[PDB]
């Protein structure tokens, strides 16, 4: 539903010309904010109050120092990747659920504990990084304040449908079989489901591949292997909020 | 840890010969975040190629969208070349037009 999430990444050995720290900020599935350590300025993305961006720049410069200081707490050579997810979700029950999770070299290892008001995790690397961050003045209070009060509030303040074009095509697979692929081109919102029917009976797992387009829309396809010469018994049903009701997609004629 | 990339190649709109369009290569699920990606035309790297910012998903794996405006023809063949530390050799994934 409604989320406001920040994606933070630091690398101890960034490839040449690339930032050591960068952040994206998301309202639901849409990115509205970016920041990187090379430029040092919070910036709007896509469609997106000057005091707000000055404030984001202030905070993310602080986060940047915090993340790079984590590598000093670990010591050694690494190289390291530190990731962080910070923000809010508004569930159907009306509760703000916060997220404050951290991954080290692709593995979750630390989170922010609302009760203790401090970062923590099971292993020495979590303790060592948490303790480095606690030495940063006001840093834990800023985190707690953000998760419990600022971010729910902003999510309310910070608070479109393009239906997909459908294609159901068959291609030879291997002798004895074809593969049907059902594709949804250029749609929004990203939620979308696809199912197959063989002569009116459900078939396949429903699983399919999803992907973004560079204009904010999305792409999806689902594939199923069927018996040769039995492709005409199949059709595809798509569910999407741009459609007033699920839509039957018949096999491409030629 | 290491996670090998998933590679998807698709057009923004249903492809029609002579009609402009966008070609996407979605590369996702990988760790660590260093990756080389190229779009190919008849086996050769395309140059005017944009890509989104490196970001990551809930499972912390990274993802990148590469894309370019193009006008497909009958004879022109498109693909995506991905290189990553988890790969002995780079992967080349064709834009499959019968899919």
């Amino acid at each position: 539903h409604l989320s406001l999430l920040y994606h933070l990444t630091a690398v101890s050995s960034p490839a040449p010309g690339t930032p050591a720290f960068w952040v994206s900020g998301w309202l639901g599935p849409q990115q509205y904010l970016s920041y990187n350590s090379l430029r040092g300025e919070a910036e709007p993305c896509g469609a997106w109050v000057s005091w707000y961006w000055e404030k984001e720049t202030t905070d993310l410069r602080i986060k940047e120092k915090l993340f790079l200081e984590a590598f000093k707490a670990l010591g050694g050579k690494g190289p390291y990747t530190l990731q962080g997810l910070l923000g809010c979700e508004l569930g159907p029950d009306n509760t703000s659920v916060p997220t404050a999770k951290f991954a080290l070299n692709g593995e979750e290892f630390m989170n922010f504990d609302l009760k203790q008001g401090t970062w923590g995790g099971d292993w020495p690397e979590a303790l060592a990084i948490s303790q480095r961050w606690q030495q940063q003045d006001k840093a834990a209070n800023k985190e707690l304040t953000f998760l419990l009060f600022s971010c729910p509030h902003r999510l309310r303040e910070h608070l479109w449908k393009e239906p997909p074009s459908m294609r159901l095509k068959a291609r030879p697979s291997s002798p004895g079989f074809s593969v049907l692929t059902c594709s949804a081109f250029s749609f929004y919102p990203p939620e979308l489901q696809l199912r197959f029917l063989r002569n009116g009976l459900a078939a396949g797992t429903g699983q399919g591949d999803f992907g973004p387009n560079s204009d904010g829309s999305f792409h999806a396809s689902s594939s199923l292997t069927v018996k040769s010469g039995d492709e005409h018994h199949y059709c595809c049903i798509v569910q999407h909020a741009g459609l007033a009701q699920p839509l039957r997609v018949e096999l491409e004629s030629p | 840890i290491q996670r090998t990339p998933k590679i998807q190649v698709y057009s923004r709109h249903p492809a029609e010969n002579g009609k402009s369009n966008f070609l996407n290569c979605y590369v996702s699920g990988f760790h660590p975040s260093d990756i080389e990606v190229d779009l190919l035309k008849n086996g050769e790297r395309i140059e005017k190629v944009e890509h989104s910012d490196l970001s990551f998903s809930k499972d912390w794996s990274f993802y990148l969208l590469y894309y370019t405006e193009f006008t497909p023809t009958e004879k022109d063949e498109y693909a995506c070349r991905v290189n990553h530390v988890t790969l002995s050799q780079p992967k080349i994934v064709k834009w499959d037009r019968d899919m």
Epitope: A73, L74, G75, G76, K77, G78, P79, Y80, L104, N105, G106, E107, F109, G120, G121, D122, W123, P124, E125, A126, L127, A128 | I1, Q2, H31, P32, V85
Partner: antibody
Amino acid sequence: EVQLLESGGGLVQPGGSLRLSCAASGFTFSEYAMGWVRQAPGKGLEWVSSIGSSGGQTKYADSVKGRFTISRDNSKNTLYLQMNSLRAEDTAVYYCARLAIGDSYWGQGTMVTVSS
Amino acid sequence: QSALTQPASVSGSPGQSITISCTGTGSDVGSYNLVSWYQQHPGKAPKLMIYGDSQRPSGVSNRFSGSKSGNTASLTISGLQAEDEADYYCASYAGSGIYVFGTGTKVTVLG
């Protein structure tokens, strides 16, 4: 002063079981992952097992997987090591260790002898 | 897992510098480790001399120093003294509670 106190070591017949305990004091126990390291007489150090600060995650050396269980009681400030299916090659001094980056407090060890 | 390798024995004269290697210390791309060195006197529990490849705990003489390159780590002891006669172990922390100890080197001070 950080203090770790092993106990529970003794003689055991092979195939028997034994439970080691480590009493901790002098630091916030529940913030630290804890581990066991052992040393057979005249031999080198061998990491045995680690448990995360909350008890939620455990790790074991291959020579010990399936037979040993590490556990902790954060209200009693105690680390444990449950050892089943003991073998002669488990004979060693067993050390309790506080896991940290930048320091390393150990107990003095408890002696386990596995012999018929 | 499986041990890191050290020479079983290294010896030097009083005031000499000596070096102990540790082999098997490399990490896969995407992973890391931190190398520690322990000193163990007879009867006593191991004592930490180096952490994080090259850091000394407060109180450890600066005669002790360490380094790590690729698949090896090294401990150097300068101005060797008879009190340094001990067993030395390297150790590798790979994160997530996993350690492995080297096989150990006995240091003998001659003369």
